[model samples]
Target: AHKSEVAHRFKDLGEENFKALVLIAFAQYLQQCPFEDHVKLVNEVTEFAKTCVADESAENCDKSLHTLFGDKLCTVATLRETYGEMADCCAKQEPERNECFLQHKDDNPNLPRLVRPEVDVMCTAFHDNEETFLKKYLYEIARRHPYFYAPELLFFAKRYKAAFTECCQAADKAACLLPKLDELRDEGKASSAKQRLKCASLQKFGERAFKAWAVARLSQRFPKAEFAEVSKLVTDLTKVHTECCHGDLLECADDRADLAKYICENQDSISSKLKECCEKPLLEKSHCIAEVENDEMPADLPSLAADFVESKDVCKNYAEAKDVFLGMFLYEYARRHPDYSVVLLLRLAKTYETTLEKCCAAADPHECYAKVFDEFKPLVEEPQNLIKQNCELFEQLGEYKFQNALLVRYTKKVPQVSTPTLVEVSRNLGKVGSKCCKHPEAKRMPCAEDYLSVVLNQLCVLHEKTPVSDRVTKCCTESLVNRRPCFSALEVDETYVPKEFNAETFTFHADICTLSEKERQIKKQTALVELVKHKPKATKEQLKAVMDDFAAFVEKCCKADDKETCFAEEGKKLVAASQAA
Candidate 1:
C-alpha cells in the first residue's frame, strides 16, 4: 500500500510538474545530440510535451516550456519532427537518404533543438487554451484570494464588456441581458459565484462561452422591437456597467425588480442617464433639452415656403437679365413687367412677334423662328381663348414674313443663336452680310459694297423716326466706307448708282484715261511680251483678247469697290492697260 501510494504520488507529480521538467531535460539533451539523432530526439520530446500539456493549462505550460527551451531550440525541434519522418523513410535507400538529410541540415542552420511533431498543434493549443487557463488560474485566484489577481480581474472584465458591446451579436444579447441584469442584482452570493465561474470559464476558453451565449440570444431576440430599441439605448451601457461594477472595492446591493421597474417607467431618464454616463468625460455639468434643440434647423413650414419663394424670384430675375441686351423676349417681358403671363393675348402676341423679328434680325433667323414656335406653338394650339386671340396677330403679321423671311435673308447666321429666345437673339443681320461676302453665292449676288449701300439706305429709312444714338450714327457712316458691310438688306434696286459716279466730267475723264494711258501703255506692253514669247507679234486679235481679259478685271474691281475710288481712277487704269496691250 505504501509503495502504491508512493507510485501514485510520483504519477501525479509526473502528470504535472515532473512531466514539464522531463520535457525541459529532453529538450536540453536533444540540443547536444548529433544533428540526425538530435532531430529524432526532438521529435520524441515534442510528442511527449504535447501529450503532457494538451489541456487548457497547456498554453501556460507551452509559454513556460518555450521560455526554458528558447526559440532556436524549439525551431530545430519543429523542423526535425516534420522532415525527420521523411528522412527515416528515405534512408531505406542509401545514397538519396544520406544526401537528403545532409542537404536539409545545410538548409536549416537555426533549427530548434526540440522539434514540434505537429507545429500547428502547439501554436493552436496555446491560442485555444490561453483564456481557459487564465480564467481558471487568474480569475479564480483574483475572486477567491483577492490579493494577486483582483485588479487584473477588474481590468479584464471592463475590457471584456467594452469588446462585447462593440460586437453586433454580443450587443443584441447584452440588450436582452440588460433587462435581466437587475434580476441578478439582489442575488449577491449567487451573482458573485456565477460571475466568478464565468470569469474562470472565460479565462479557460477565451471568447467561447460569451460568444456562444451572445450569438444564440442575439439571434433569438434580434427581431423584437424592445430589443432593437434597447440596443441603440445601451450602446455604451456595458462600459458604464463595467466601471460601476469594478471601480469600487465594495459593491452596492440594489433590488432587481425595483431597478427594472425604474428603467421601464423612466425610459427617457434612463436614456439620459446612459447618455450622461458617456458624456460625463466631455461635459462637466448636466446638459439641457434646449442644447440639443438649438443644434437643429427651424421646422416651421411657413419659413421654408417664404425662403423658397424668395429663392425662386431671385432665380427668375437672374434668368431674365442673363441675356437681356441680346433681345430675348423673356428678358424684355421681365424688364417691362414682373410677369408676362398676365398680359392680354393680343398684346402678348404682338410682343412675341416683335421679339421674334428683332431676334431673327440680330441673331440667327432660323433659331429665332424655331424658338418662337417652340414657346408659342403650345400656346397657340391650346384650346384656350388666348390661342384665337394670338392667331389674329399671326394673320396680321403674315406667317411667311415672320418665320421664312429672316432665314432666306440670313441663313448663314443660324448657328450663332441655338439657345432659343431664353438667352439671345437668333441672328445678327450685319454678321450675316459679312459672312455672305466669303460665300460662293455672294460672287453671283450683289457684292458686299452694293449690299451695304442697300442696307444703309434701308436703315436710314427704318430708324429715321427713332432717336439714333451718336454711336449708332457714327457706326453707320463708318460702315459705308468700311472693309465689310454694316447691315444686311432684304431687297436690291439695280438702277441705283452713287451720285459721284454719274457726273459727265467724271465719266469722260475715266473713259479717256482708260483708252489712252492704260490700254496703250500697260495692256500693249504685257500682250506684246506674251506674244513675242510665243513666236507671234501683237495683233488686233491678241489685243482684243487682252481687252477681254481687262474688261473682266474691271468688272471684278467694280464688284469689290467699297468706295467711289475703285470705280473711277482704278477702273480707268485697268481699262487703259487692256486697250493698250
Candidate 2:
C-alpha cells in the first residue's frame, strides 16, 4: 500500500484524506501478517507514514511494498490466504479499488478464546525467555480482550509477570504460581464483563450521558487529576469506547495506545498510583494502573462555583451548551462529594437540569433556581443510608454470603420475578461489594453506591425487556436516586418460603486447611449462607447454634494430623447437628 505507484494513484484524495486511506491500508496489511512480523511491520509503516507526510511525495516514501509483499506472500501461509482474497480487490481500478480494499479488510480472524495459560506452559516460558514470554502474554491478553484499553492490558500483564518472576524463584513453583494465576484469570474475566457493561451504557445513553457519568467517576478515581486533566482523560476515554464499542478494533487500539502514552507522560498530574504505574516497566504500567485505588475526596475542595449556581445568566449559559452546563455541575458535585455514587451524581445533574428548565421559563430565574440545592440535599439522604447499610452487610457477611442474602431478600421482595433474574441481580450486587468495599472508608460509599446503582439499572433494563413485576416496574419509573430505595421499601411476599437445611447442610472439606485465612473465611461464609438458605424458617438462636457448631468443627478438624480423615468423621456430626437444629 505504501508503494510509490499505489500511493501516486491516490494523490488526488488530498493530503488529509490520503493519510487516512494510507493508514487504513496499513491496518489492512497488518491484519494479514503472522504475529512475529507485526512489530517490525508497524515500525516500518509508522516511519513510512511520517516521512511520507513530511516530504509530501510518493517517490520519497518507502516503496518496499513489492519486496515486503513477495516476502510475506511466498512464506506466510496466513498472509497468502489473506492476500489471495485481497488480489481481486487490488485488480480493480482507482476509487473502487480503494473502497474495495477498505470493505474487504478482515475481521479479527485469530481472536484467541479467553483462557488462562497453563501453569507448566507459563513457568516454562518464564524460565526459557522471560522478556519474550511477557511480551507474548501481554499481546495475547490484548487481542483476546480487544476492547480493553492498552493500559488495562498492561496492568494485567504486569501482575502476571510479577507473579511469575517471584513464583519461578520460589521453593514450590507450582504451589506459589497456581493460585496467583487463577486470581489474575478471574480478575481478567470480571474486568472484561465490566468493560462490556460500560460499553452498553454508552450505547444506551449516548456519548454526553456517558461522559457526564465518566467525569464524576474519573474525578473520584484520581482526585489530583485537575478539572482540565480529568476532562482530557474523559475525552480520550470516550473515544476509546466509541471506537471499541462500535467494533473498530484497530482504531480502538490506536486510541487506547495514545491514551496510555499521554497518561504515562503526564502521570504526575493524575494520581499517585498512576505516577507509580508510569515508573514501572512500559509493559507493566497499565496493568499496575488497573488496580489503583480511588483517591480520598479532598477535604479542601472548593464549593460549586457561584457563577454556576447564582449567576443571572444561568439559563442563557445552559441553552448555549446544556452539556457543558450539566457537565460543570457534575464535576463540581464530584469534587465536593467525590465519594458520591455516579447514579446519585447523575441524579443531581438531572435535578439541576430540571430546575434550570423551570427557572429559564420563570419571571425570576435566580429565585426559582435557588431551591435546587435543597432538592439535591434531600434526595441524597436515602441513597446515602442505602449505601451505608449495604456496605455494612458486605462487611459483616463477606462477599459470598452478602450476595446470597441479597438473593433471599430480593426473592422474598419480588417472588413474582424469575429465580434466574433475581440470581443475576444478586450476583451483580455481590460484584459491587467485592470490587467497591475494598476501597478506604471515604471512597467506599461512592464506589458501592455507583456500582450498586448499575445493578439496579440492570434490573430496570430487565423490566424493560420483560415486565418483572408491578412493584419493580413502578420503582423503575422513580427518580434514579430514589429508585433503589423504592425497591428496598417494596412489600415482602409473605407466602414465599425458602428450602430448609437438612443433615447435609453444613459440611467442610480438608481443602480448607491449605487455604489462606481470607480464603478460608470465604468458605466459612459460604457455609453460613447455606444455613441461612436451608433454614429460613429457623429462629436466629437456632441458626446461631448450627453456625457455632460448624465453626467449632472447623477449629477442631483443621489442626488435626490427618485433616481429610477428621473432616470425614466430624463433617457428619456437623451435618447431623444442623438437621437437629
Residue 292, candidate 1: how far off, in angstroms?
Answer: 54
Q: What is the model-wide C-alpha lDDT for candidate 1?
A: 0.31
Candidate 2 TM-score over all chains jointly:
0.61
Give the Å error, residue 371, model 1. Answer: 9.1
Worst lDDT run of 10 residues, candidate 2, spans: 16-25
- Show model 2 residue runs off by greater than 4 Å: 1-151, 154-158, 161-169, 221-229, 267-274, 287-302, 395-398, 413-421, 431-441, 454-581
Best by TM-score: 2
lDDT of 1 by residue, 197-256 (tens): 323223333343333222222212221223334333233222222322221111101111
Task: Go through the candidates in order and give the C-alpha RMSD of each one to the true structure.
Answer: 41.1, 9.7
Model 2: per-residue Cα lDDT over 459-509, one tens digit each: 665555568477777776655455666877876655556555555446677
Among these predictions, the greatest lDDT belongs to: 2
User: Once model 1 is optimally superposed onto the true structure by TM-score, how far is the C-alpha of residue 373 displaced, in angstroms?
Assistant: 3.5
lDDT of each: 0.31, 0.63
Error of 1 at 403 (Å): 28
